[PDB]
């Protein structure tokens, strides 16, 4: 497996699209810190470190909207959109002045900085940049 991060986000995107309550992703002290942001900002209900066949995972509790009126009652997503920015194929790094404004404020950019994993908003606050991990809304 070549990108653990991209893998996680996709495990999520894929599940959210058939409306699973949760999904398991292989555990990591870096992936968690990202989940810590996904939950805090209310994209997920949250996560808990579980175990499958002796091996550490992160069970991720997914969140959606109301049932709907019309022929397609499938609720709206909370995570409509999540995608790698930086990648192993091309590391993407921004300085503070060039951190993007996701979706006109309504979305976030998680980034990894030397002050930990932050959002665009938070990064601007401590005034640091870093590897732009991804974008969510």
């Amino acid at each position: 497996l070549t990108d653990p991060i991209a893998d996680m986000l996709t495990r999520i995107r894929n599940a959210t699209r058939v409306y699973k309550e949760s999904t398991d992703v292989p555990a990591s002290r870096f992936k968690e810190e990202i989940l810590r942001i996904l939950a805090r900002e209310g994209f997920i209900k949250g996560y808990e470190r579980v175990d499958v066949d002796g091996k550490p995972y992160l069970r991720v509790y997914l969140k959606y909207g109301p049932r709907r009126q019309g022929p397609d009652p499938r609720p709206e997503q909370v995570i409509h959109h999540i995608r790698r920015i930086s990648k192993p194929g091309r590391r993407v790094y921004v300085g503070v002045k060039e951190i993007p404004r996701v979706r006109r404020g309504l979305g976030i950019a998680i980034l990894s900085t030397s002050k930990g994993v932050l959002t665009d908003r938070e990064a601007r606050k401590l005034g640091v940049g870093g590897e732009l991990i991804c974008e969510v809304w």
Binding site: G89, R90, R91, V92
Partner: protein, 99 residues
């Protein structure tokens, strides 16, 4: 300051001179990705103390000969023949790129 660079010695076959290979990374000015580029410097070694495989630092210096404008600053590591392999094997592949 006098520019200082670090690299592997790939040749000791000159008298009082070593070929030191210095490597560097930088993002592609358009495609972003971090890319490596390398370069050989003829470094002055009056003492013939530097061996093949040494990792060393070299400091820009007043010109010693045509092409030699660096003296060897100091030893850093010894016995990196694995680096020397990477270079030597690459040159050996060149016999296979011709016609």
């Amino acid at each position: 300051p006098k520019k200082v660079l670090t690299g592997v010695v790939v040749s000791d076959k000159m008298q009082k001179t070593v070929t030191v290979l210095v490597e560097r990374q930088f993002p592609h000015p358009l495609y972003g990705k971090v890319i490596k580029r390398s370069k050989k410097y003829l470094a002055h070694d009056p003492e013939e103390k530097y061996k093949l495989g040494d990792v060393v630092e070299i400091i820009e210096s007043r010109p010693i000969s045509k092409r030699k404008r660096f003296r060897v600053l100091r030893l850093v590591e010894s016995g990196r023949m694995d680096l020397v392999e990477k270079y030597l094997i690459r040159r050996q592949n060149y016999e296979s790129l011709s016609k």
